[PDB]
Design a protein around this ligand. Structure first.
Ligand code: AGS
Ligand code: MG
Length: 452
């Protein structure tokens, strides 16, 4: 029984163990709760976010603990209950999302153990915590941190309650760390060091101090046009990131003026299938302007792209993020500082156009500061879909500035991100970034004109 957990023996309203995989927190807590039940007539609620069947709960772990220590003859074991025959202590097992009503009605709970608590949503906490209201009752929590902004992390680490005993552990704190897990761990440490730190050292995902777009801006910008009462006006712009020859999904983004309407991923496609997919989406979206990344495997797509739009007045622009910024000799607008003095290249230029729109939108939504909707950006959540919106947000928050020896704004490249961060190429984020750019001049009545 790892001495690190000794503080959980003392009385505290909150006992929270956070750590990486194989750290021993589950075995330690099960052991302590079993020893408590042997000695006090405690009612113990074992809760989790989702319990689709009893096998998803800790009941088996508790049974194994009982048998391991040789306490079997002291207990009654049923499908969904464990009871001590001497104290009448009782364990019960419920999923919060499954049985919210049952949970609210439970009486006399002395200890609540929330396991796998990283999955527990704010709404679940808000249901569960008020029910554990007996004087001297305790809430025990074990979790492997996910994102620093997830409720469980915010609730117990960043903005903690009174009387919390917080322990942080990892596999190095587990004197019984088994070989099978050690092998997985060392394998991971070598293959993906960043992932290893998250999984095995229990470090939550959080924003780099070099990140350019904050999660909270993206949350505010979600349906900002509904929140603030404006609607989409402008051209429809679509963009395609053809990715590479690797596994990473291709990307597509489309907006109608300041309202983003579609974020799509292209899986198991070659370069031509991907271009066909993306140009078809652009047509379906009624695009006036289409861009695609020409810096890599996309450099040869011009003919297929313009062919796909034949007969339709849709501009087609090859975006090369490595090029000097668009309009680089023009004055920069937030002796004269030019756009070219500020941005190293187009990739930086348009990622900052995106970030600037998002920040303005954030200040409008959250701080009530006025801004022209044309300068904002809103995500139409119903149109895009929660699933793809979340995928996009997870990529956008990883886009990082890097040091630049001429004091220009420059971002880590997709290749660098994969190498350093151990993540797939952020192709949805790049597709969205590219649709920030509108270099082709057009009118219903006129030619397409591409100044340069
Ligand atoms: N007190 C102990 N005695 C014997 N073996 C232990 C003990 N504590 C941990 N272990 C072993 O270490 C392994 C991991 O412990 P766990 O408690 O399951 O860690 P964990 O932090 O809950 O892992 P995650 O986040 O579930 S993968 C167990 O499967 C046991 O094999
Ligand atoms: Mg565990």
């Amino acid at each position: 029984i790892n001495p690190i957990f000794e503080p959980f023996i003392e009385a505290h309203r909150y006992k929270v163990a956070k750590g990486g995989r194989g750290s021993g927190k589950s075995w330690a807590i099960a052991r302590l709760l079993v020893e408590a039940a042997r000695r006090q007539p405690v009612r113990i609620l074992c809760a989790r976010e989702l319990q689709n069947s009893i096998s998803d709960s800790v009941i088996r772990l508790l049974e194994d603990t009982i048998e391991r220590e040789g306490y079997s003859a002291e207990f009654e074991i049923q499908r969904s209950m464990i009871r001590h025959l001497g104290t009448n202590a009782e364990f019960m097992f419920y999923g919060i999302k499954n049985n919210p009503t049952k949970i609210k009605s439970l009486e006399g709970i002395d200890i609540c153990w929330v396991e796998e608590a990283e999955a527990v949503t704010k709404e679940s906490w808000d249901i569960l915590i008020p029910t554990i209201r007996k004087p001297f009752s305790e809430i025990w929590v074990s979790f492997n941190p996910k994102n620093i902004l997830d409720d469980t992390y915010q609730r117990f680490v960043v903005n903690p309650p009174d009387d919390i005993c917080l322990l942080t552990v990892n596999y190095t704190d587990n004197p019984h760390f088994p070989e099978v897990l050690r092998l997985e761990m060392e394998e991971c440490k070598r293959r993906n060091p960043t992932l290893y730190r998250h999984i095995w050292l229990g470090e939550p995902v959080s924003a780099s101090d070099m990140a350019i777009i904050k999660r909270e801006w993206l949350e505010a910008a979600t349906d900002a046009h509904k929140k603030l009462g404006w609607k989409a006006k402008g051209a429809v712009v679509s963009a395609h990131d053809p990715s590479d020859t690797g596994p990473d999904a291709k990307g597509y983004a489309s907006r109608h003026g300041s309202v983003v309407k579609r974020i799509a991923e292209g899986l198991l496609m070659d370069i031509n299938e991907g271009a066909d997919w993306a140009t078809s989406l652009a047509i379906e979206d009624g695009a006036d302007h289409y861009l695609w990344d020409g810096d890599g495997v996309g450099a040869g797509l011009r003919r297929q792209t313009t062919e796909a739009f034949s007969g339709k007045k849709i501009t087609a622009t090859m975006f090369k993020g490595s090029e000097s910024p668009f309009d680089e000799d023009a004055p920069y607008q937030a002796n004269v500082r030019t756009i070219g003095d500020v941005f190293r290249n187009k990739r930086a230029q348009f990622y900052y156009a995106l970030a600037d729109r998002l920040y303005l939108t954030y200040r409008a939504v959250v701080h009530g500061e006025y801004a022209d909707p044309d300068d904002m950006l809103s995500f139409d959540k119903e149109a895009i879909g929660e699933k793809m919106l979340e995928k996009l947000f997870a990529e956008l928050t990883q886009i990082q500035r890097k040091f630049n020896n001429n004091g220009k704004l420059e971002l880590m490249t997709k290749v660098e991100m994969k190498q350093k961060l151990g993540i797939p190429s952020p192709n949805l984020a790049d597709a969205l970034m590219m649709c920030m750019h509108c270099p082709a001049l057009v009118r219903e009545e006129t030619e397409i004109y591409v100044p340069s």
